[PDB]
Ligand binder design. Structure first.
Ligand SMILES: N[C@@H](CCC(=O)N[C@@H](CS)C(=O)NCC(=O)O)C(=O)O
Ligand SMILES: N[C@@H](CCC(=O)N[C@@H](CS)C(=O)NCC(=O)O)C(=O)O
Lengths: 215, 215
């Protein structure tokens, strides 16, 4: 049974959790609490990891880091990355465009100047969301009729960005509607209501935005 | 004949250029000069691009953005991404670990506080480089005997990081040796000596680090 190691936060790994749950995949978690950085520094080089980091995925022999390699791998095992170069690259484009939002948040969230940097990010964010709103015009999910992993990436980014600004989706009905549709997927619905859902923090606990024990 | 659009800078796209040259691939470039931001704002939505950005790749019907989707696509056309989920994920791990360095630089390079932020990045950088030095112990390239696209990604990151600190490879002989080996690849050697090589800037021209018309 594979292992997903990460902090007990949403952060980089939350979209991978959602995808594991959507595929009804078994996995145990190594969850590093806020006060358990020492427990991590003590396992870091003892896991057989060639690029030691968090998150890590361990599928006995397959010993993986980098959250994007991990999410893509799980999708790969279920044959969900694309059937030719073209489709594979559209998925990788969806992927990276979502990351522009999610990393956009992460890159300012630990800054002393978070509050002012917030203004410049929320100015840009409508252009970014519009690309996704247009893609979902006549298209149920990001890649058509079936879920792919960038759907869960997008879901995660909308969730996070709605804490930063509760009104940032009011111009984007198809995006509001996408977020609900992911929530209605029976597997996802059971997970978000379960003991395993980590509601908070969005970021590391020490962050100006999305940190702390509670919202 | 496909088109690679980008600023006339190294930036996000330089590793893709290197890979196109290694594969002896034909491509014309759209190169946005420093003073040509208006020329770009005027083509941005007229290219058939669903997530308009720079870089973009256009392979007639295939209309792509996001530099990581683009680099991976070109490699895909040459069957270089991996033959099973396992190998595909190792490549994606190599990829992302290199990006930790390259984005690590980009994320501070435009900051007012660049010079102090530089200190904290160069403190971390030896741990990051050590993972690559260890991987290249008994292994010619990052993935064994053959070049894969993360090799050119690593090359780009070493080049950039050596401007930040000319001595940052003095503890890492196998990495110094990797950088030279890429330079000795006949295709790469011809490109770096050619009119097409864009030596500078490393970043956008407005950057504190790696900017300006000249080094
Ligand atoms: N690009 C990497 C980023 C790795 C990273 O910045 N990891 C953070 C977690 S948010 C960490 O605290 N890692 C522990 C460590 O560096 O030892 C990824 O996608 O996994
Ligand atoms: N994650 C994206 C980043 C896109 C990006 O930040 N592009 C910069 C170039 S360094 C830009 O000036 N794009 C022009 C625009 O946003 O209209 C990628 O890898 O292509």
């Amino acid at each position: 049974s594979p292992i997903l190691g990460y902090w007990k936060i949403k952060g980089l790994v939350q979209p991978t959790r959602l995808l594991l749950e959507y595929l009804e995949e078994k996995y145990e978690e190594h969850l590093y609490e806020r006060d358990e950085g020492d427990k991590w520094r003590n396992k870091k080089f003892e896991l057989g990891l060639e690029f030691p980091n968090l998150p890590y995925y361990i599928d006995g022999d397959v010993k993986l880091t980098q959250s994007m390699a991990i999410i893509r791998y799980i999708a790969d095992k279920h044959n969900m990355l694309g059937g030719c170069p073209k489709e594979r690259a559209e998925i990788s484009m969806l992927e990276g465009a979502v990351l522009d939002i999610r990393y956009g948040v992460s890159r300012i969230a630990y800054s002393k100047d978070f509050e002012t940097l917030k203004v410049d990010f929320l100015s840009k964010l409508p252009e970014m969301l519009k690309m996704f709103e247009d893609r979902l015009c006549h298209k149920t999910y990001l890649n058509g009729d079936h879920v792919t992993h960038p759907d869960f990436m997008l879901y995660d980014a909308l969730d996070v960005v709605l804490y930063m600004d509760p009104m940032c989706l009011d111009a984007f009905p198809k995006l509001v509607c996408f977020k609900k549709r992911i929530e209605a997927i029976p597997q996802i619905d059971k997970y978000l209501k379960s003991s395993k859902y980590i509601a908070w923090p969005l970021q590391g606990w020490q962050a100006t935005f999305g940190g702390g024990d509670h919202p």
